[PDB]
């Protein structure tokens, strides 16, 4: 069974594929050189920075550091709106609710704490505590003001109702620990990258693995959806970034250079999807052409590994966070 | 050049900055210890002296310590070890009963080699305890250590056997120029282990202080 099927899948995958997108885009002109500058430089942390998330209004962001502190910045003036003292000093993920009233963070405590920003007393308070994962939390994303999705190190993903705190749905099938996940723009589907060098697609409502993607040979650390919603890009830890087509269920192409050996820690697109920002352990973020596989530039300037990376919802600025305890808003 | 609300927000941000700067400076004056073991090795006794992550506090000689127990994490170590490359020392425990138990010594020194020779923990000294001393004495009085160490099992006596396991265990270290291995045999818990931990931490702090100058 297993095998005969696998075969059939692979044979269909090669039969439905004739050429990739390069051939097509021989005549597409390159985007050319890209010049960017550190238009701002946020500071105040005192330890490694592991996550950051832009706000809905494209003006606020939240960063998580090992010094048990959650900070919310007004990117326009580099102020500090709030400074939440974390219960557990170990945190490796953060999330901003679309409504702008809740924030979520995880860590090695296998607990996804949810905080409230708008309070009568004017102080942030722990709205609810979430438990049920037997492994360390890895990533979390807000669906609405009541639903939350988390991926942990026990190779499981679950959708939660924060009003009750129980596992509304559980996603299983990954044989390795899940690093990161990204939700589709329509909040219908999501793709998670695990340590088994595979990506799985799931449905938010019914909850079972709609498809599966392979091609990478090592752990996948980052994943993000294309703005169109029919494609996604994943970044492994062996200096290889690949683009996949959800509808085609095939890898489109790969982004690799002979001069990079480090892994990829963060991957994100642009508003139009023409740029594919990619983090690295070489202390500098390299930007790739989504249709040319050419390094149009690098956002160098960090003294340590770049951990998190994100783009504003309006497609106007790019923010990066590194272990040097510094956040830089690029433009 | 700024309206009233912006000035008030700037003042609030300055406050928040000062509060962090104070909290961080206060938190910097304490020692963080990582705890490791092969499972049921005796870490219970050490924590007895005074979910996922487990953290304990205890103050000794006007010094606030901090111990983390990560034995409850079943995930891959490489995914999260790197988040610990700031600890002052790493406490490693091992029981002297797995030589005739199946064998677990081999796994213990395998884990010790993996942790000690890891790239992240290159400038962190390791404190290594030896649990169940009297047990071990009874075991060697019962059966020799040929099972775990067929090559040079040695004379069945406390002096030879105790030294023998030590030399092997610290032989796995390879960055002998930078890292140090502090060893100590578990006594009857007569308020002596904490003294040894304090001495080792003071030595490590002295070396770190002299490193920068």
């Amino acid at each position, epitope marked *: 069974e297993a095998e005969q099927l696998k075969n059939q899948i692979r044979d269909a995958r090669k039969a439905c594929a004739d050429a990739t997108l390069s051939q097509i885009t021989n005549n597409i002109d390159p985007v050319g050189r890209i010049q960017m500058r550190t238009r701002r430089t946020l500071r105040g942390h005192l330890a490694k920075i592991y996550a950051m998330h832009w706000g809905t209004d494209s003006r606020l962001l939240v960063s998580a550091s090992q010094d048990g502190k959650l900070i919310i910045w007004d990117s326009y003036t580099t102020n500090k709106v709030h400074a939440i003292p974390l219960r557990s000093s170990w945190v490796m993920t953060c999330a901003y609710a679309p409504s702008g009233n809740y924030v979520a963070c995880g860590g090695l405590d296998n607990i996804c704490s949810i905080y409230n920003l708008k309070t009568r*007393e004017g*102080n942030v308070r722990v709205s609810r505590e979430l438990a049920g994962h037997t492994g360390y939390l890895s990533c979390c994303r807000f669906l609405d003001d009541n639903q939350i999705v988390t991926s942990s190190g026990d190779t499981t993903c679950a959708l939660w109702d924060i009003e009750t705190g129980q596992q509304t749905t559980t996603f299983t099938g990954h044989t390795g620990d899940v690093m990161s996940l990204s939700l589709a723009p329509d909040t219908r589907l999501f793709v998670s990258g695990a340590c088994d060098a595979s990506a799985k697609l799931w449905d938010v409502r019914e909850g079972m693995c709609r498809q599966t993607f392979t091609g990478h040979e090592s752990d996948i650390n980052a994943i993000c959806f294309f703005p169109n919603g029919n494609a996604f890009a994943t970044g492994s830890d062996d200096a290889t970034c690949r683009l996949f087509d959800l509808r085609a269920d095939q890898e489109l192409m790969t982004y690799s250079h002979d001069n990079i050996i480090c892994g990829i820690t963060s991957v994100s697109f642009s508003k139009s999807g023409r740029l594919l920002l990619a983090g690295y352990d070489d202390f500098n973020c390299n930007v790739w052409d989504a249709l040319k596989a050419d390094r149009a530039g690098v956002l160098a300037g960090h003294d340590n590994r770049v951990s998190c990376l994100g783009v504003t919802d309006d497609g106007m600025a790019v923010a990066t966070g590194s272990w040097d305890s510094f956040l830089k808003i690029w433009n | 050049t700024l*309206s009233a*609300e912006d000035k008030a*927000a700037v*003042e*609030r941000s300055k406050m928040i900055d000062r509060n962090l700067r104070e909290d961080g400076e206060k938190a910097a004056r304490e020692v963080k210890l990582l705890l490791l073991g092969a499972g049921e090795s005796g870490k219970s006794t050490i924590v007895k002296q005074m979910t996922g992550i487990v953290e304990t506090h205890f103050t000794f000689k006007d010094l606030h310590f901090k111990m983390f127990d990560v034995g409850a994490q079943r995930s891959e170590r490489k995914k999260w070890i790197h988040c610990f490359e700031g600890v002052t020392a790493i406490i490693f425990c091992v029981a002297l009963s797995d030589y005739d138990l199946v064998n677990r010594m081999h796994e213990s020194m395998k884990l010790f080699d993996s942790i000690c020779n890891n790239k992240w923990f290159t400038d962190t000294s390791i404190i290594l305890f030896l649990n169940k001393k009297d047990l071990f004495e009874e075991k060697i009085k019962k059966s020799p250590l040929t099972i775990c160490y067929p090559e040079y099992a040695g004379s069945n006596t406390y002096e030879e056997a105790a030294a023998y396991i030590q030399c092997q265990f610290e032989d796995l270290n390879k960055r002998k120029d930078t890292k140090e291995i502090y060893t100590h045999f578990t006594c009857s818990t007569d308020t002596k282990n904490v003294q040894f931990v304090f001495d080792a931490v003071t030595d490590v702090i002295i070396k770190n202080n002299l490193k920068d100058c």
Partner: single-chain antibody
Amino acid sequence: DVQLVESVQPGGSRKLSCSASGFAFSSFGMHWVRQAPEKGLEWVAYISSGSGTIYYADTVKGRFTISRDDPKNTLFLQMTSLRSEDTAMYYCVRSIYYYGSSPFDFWGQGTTLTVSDIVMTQISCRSSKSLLHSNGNTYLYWFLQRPGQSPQLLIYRMSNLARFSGSGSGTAFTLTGVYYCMQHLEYPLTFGAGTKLEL
């Protein structure tokens, strides 16, 4: 639940204490508003969070002193050398300032007592200087004082709601009890004339 509790021959001195409970008193800026018995309200004093900046109305400059007891969660408004033009009712008003915050969102029950400088004339009320800063923020607050208790904030920045609506532009603001419209550009605040709605 959040609430504020606060409790003279001419030329004397008096001490006014405002008691706060049910919220983080240390993180709020405390103001002080004097409500005239029949002549509206006027700004008097304000003490930033952390006992930093302090501002007084130029009428009672120097002769009035204000202070906060942060450990005791009290605000002290000490009055020295009172005059005849001081008989009025006083209000305890709190405020918190950050991006998207809501200043003047709560008011004290009020305690009675008996013994530059833009125009804020007065539904729509006008102004003397256009309150449109270069940052895109237009500072104007709409206040309603129903008869019987303290006023409450209705609309701030004429766009944010604390069925009510508000709009306008520079020097021309409108909103679509006695209604008060407030300015916040410059340190000395100025209250509206106060328009009475009845029947």
